[PDB]
Design a protein around this nucleic acid. Sequence first.
RNA 1: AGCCAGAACCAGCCCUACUGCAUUAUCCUGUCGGGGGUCAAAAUCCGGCGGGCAACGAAGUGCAAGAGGGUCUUGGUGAAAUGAGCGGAGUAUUUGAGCUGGCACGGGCACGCACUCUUCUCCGUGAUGCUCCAUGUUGGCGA
RNA 2: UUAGGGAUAUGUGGCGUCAAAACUUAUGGGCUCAUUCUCGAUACGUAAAGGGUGUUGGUGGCCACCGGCCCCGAAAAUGGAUGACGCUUAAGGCCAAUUAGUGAAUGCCCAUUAUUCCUUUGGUAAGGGCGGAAACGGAGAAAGUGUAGCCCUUCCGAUGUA
RNA 3: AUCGAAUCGCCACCUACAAGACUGGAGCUUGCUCCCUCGAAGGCGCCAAGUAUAUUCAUGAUCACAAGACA
Lengths: 142, 178, 48, 153
Amino acid sequence: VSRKSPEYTTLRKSCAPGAIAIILAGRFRGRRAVILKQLPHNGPLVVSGPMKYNGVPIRRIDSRYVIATSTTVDISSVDTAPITAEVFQRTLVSDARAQLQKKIDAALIAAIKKDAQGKEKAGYLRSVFTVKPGDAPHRWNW
Amino acid sequence: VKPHLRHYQVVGRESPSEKNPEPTVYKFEVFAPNFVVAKSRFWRMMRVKNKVKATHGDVLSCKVVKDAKLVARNYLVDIAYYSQRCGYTRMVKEFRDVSKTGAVSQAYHDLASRHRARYHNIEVLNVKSIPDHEVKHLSIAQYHAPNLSFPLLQRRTKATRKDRAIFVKKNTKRAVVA
Amino acid sequence: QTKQTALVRVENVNTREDATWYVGKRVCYVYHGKKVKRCVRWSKAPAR
Amino acid sequence: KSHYICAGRLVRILRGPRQDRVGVIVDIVDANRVLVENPEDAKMWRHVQNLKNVEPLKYCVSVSRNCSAKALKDALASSKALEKYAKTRTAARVEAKKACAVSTDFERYQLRVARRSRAHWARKVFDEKDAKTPVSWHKVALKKMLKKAAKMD
RNA sequence: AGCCAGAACCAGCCCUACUGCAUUAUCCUGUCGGGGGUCAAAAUCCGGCGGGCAACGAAGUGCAAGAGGGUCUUGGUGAAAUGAGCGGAGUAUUUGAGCUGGCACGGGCACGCACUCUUCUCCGUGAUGCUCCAUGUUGGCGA
RNA sequence: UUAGGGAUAUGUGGCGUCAAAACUUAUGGGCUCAUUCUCGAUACGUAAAGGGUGUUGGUGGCCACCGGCCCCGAAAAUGGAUGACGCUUAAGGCCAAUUAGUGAAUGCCCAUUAUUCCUUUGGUAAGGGCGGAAACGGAGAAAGUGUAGCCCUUCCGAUGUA
RNA sequence: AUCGAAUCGCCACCUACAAGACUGGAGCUUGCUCCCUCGAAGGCGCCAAGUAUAUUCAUGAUCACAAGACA
Ligand SMILES: [Mg+2]
Ligand SMILES: [Mg+2]
Ligand SMILES: [Mg+2]
Ligand SMILES: [Mg+2]
Ligand code: NA
């Protein structure tokens, strides 16, 4: 409750863990990922592809550069990802992060498969979002 | 859409005095855009017919009379209007509408178009719904025919405001610009 | 004219209710100069 | 041919808050205005409509002018014009438009894959039939060149 | 911490959210008679008397009280944060709405004057600081 | 009706293009066709009698009279002016709306004006501090018309020839 | 050869033609009825050459001209 406490957040309810989000900026613009959690002290979200489907690794992202759709996946993974995982000292991946990626991605894929509509959800995660001529994004539901 | 004039009943009197301890109470029916204009018309009528000024008068009541249920009827409207050249002229005209306020609004627009007469130069003497067998004008009588039917020709149909376009493909519906 | 405010017309946005959706969004004008000058990530990403 | 404006005629609303709803004409005021009502719809109580805002359909329930609600409800039910209107392709197009307006990113993806599947199978079938009867430009050219290649080369 | 970006939070300001009471009668509804018209009967219309709330968006009648978005339109990151908003303590307090027992109001009281539903309450930080300036987070650029 | 600048909202005037605004609004009603200056269309500001079955309505008895738009009546000196182009299911003329018989106060655009915020300057200006508390984040602290203004806080005015 | 640059849908199914007092075809009751193409969509394209447990993506580290490119 206390604003100084790290548990304090103000994230909008749409960006809840297990929601499928569209990336709007950065190297992975247009891909679809799954929101895992929000870092403490009202920090960024962390998302993963999983990397098998669309090639998006575990990554931090501001909630203002994401569209959180209404499609959800039930997640019950170990979610042992603190702030220290993304802090570095003052094709190459460390042998700890490389292991964390697998440990999370296997559980996430098991969750998607266990979900109903699993095949459709997998294809949905593989597809790419773009703005076509004649499109009106301001009129849509998400 | 809805008529621009409302129907008001205004009841008033002159303020009592030692000369007139119990003044006469008067009732007035007017069609006006709001109750302030309605009261202005009431006090003008009192001034020109009863020699009573607003500065020595009381307004007992001022309300709006509700319309009846919407039904297609014939309305006879007895109206009068002034102009400098002709003078004061009195007309009786029949209209088709669904309410008294609608018929009177029709009459005001009609007078504005065919005689250039403005609101403050017009007095409405009466308005009432009449039966089908008292209609004199054939242009109104034609709508009683029980077999009335006609097609809609030469229509100017516009698209919904969200779908309007500037340039479209000639035989299709695709928009090129907007 | 007052040049501190610009007017922008966007494709398929033809209504005031439509245009309200974009209040707060970021906007960019892209062009080119005559020489190569400094940019974001001039050192990290020389491809830019 | 054209559908005349008459008492008992079915219409569809074009613009405004009642857009794409069906009513029945119960009275004609003048050349511009009619009274419309549909008892089996929530927002279609008896009201006034301008004749530029309506679309006359092909059905007419046979009733007299300024009829009662009781006499119009059963006349509709007996005519079964609503069950007939629900089977045309313009009615289905209206329902499809509403369904498309209310749709999520997942449903748009589903529609995209359905259309892609249809196109793939269509082009496969076309290739198979063009093998028998050559109708493509490349097959017409191939058959035109085969006779020439049979000589010499 | 120099320069240039992005996001968050606090104070202020500016927008959009969330709203009840009165009034309906020239009205609503059922019969009877008339009048109307049709191929027959219904309606528009008038007069008798029986009831009444047109009450899901019924009036477009009068008066209304009910946190989400900006701040490259401001200042800041707690160097005295005065807060219904930050803290301590409990669970009750008292605002209305229904329903209750002298004078007023009209020719009975629609409920003026005096003595069950519905909501959060009480307490706190002076300047031995007269004035000014010095305090976040994440990247880009600068070795 | 005017100090130097932001934001919000208005006045007169507007919303087919020139030219910001109905990307040519409405789920409002009438009326009007004009062929060599010519239908008409922002006041102040630069044509009359009399005629017309052209078309639309009104009064009284198919008639006589009174209206609305339009047409004759209407003839000068460089080529030229609703400001130009153009407009006729108007972009004209009279009336009336605000997203429309749905169910509740403000469609939109533009000022050296209004409200509000920042800074300057001047007042018939209005308050406060100025015996160095002590110790040891930084410095300063003047009894003062006027300064690089002794230092803070507050309110109101600001154009101008001779 | 200078040259780095702004632009971000493709098609040998649109890329033929007329009408809007009227328009798929019949009737005769000429404004209704009946038939069926049902009279309100150019085709594709948007990440497995196609709807199916196939498959490399990271360190380009949280926005920055898309560090890509003419399907
Ligand atoms: Mg413009
Ligand atoms: Mg001063
Ligand atoms: Mg001066
Ligand atoms: Mg680039
Ligand atoms: Na002009």
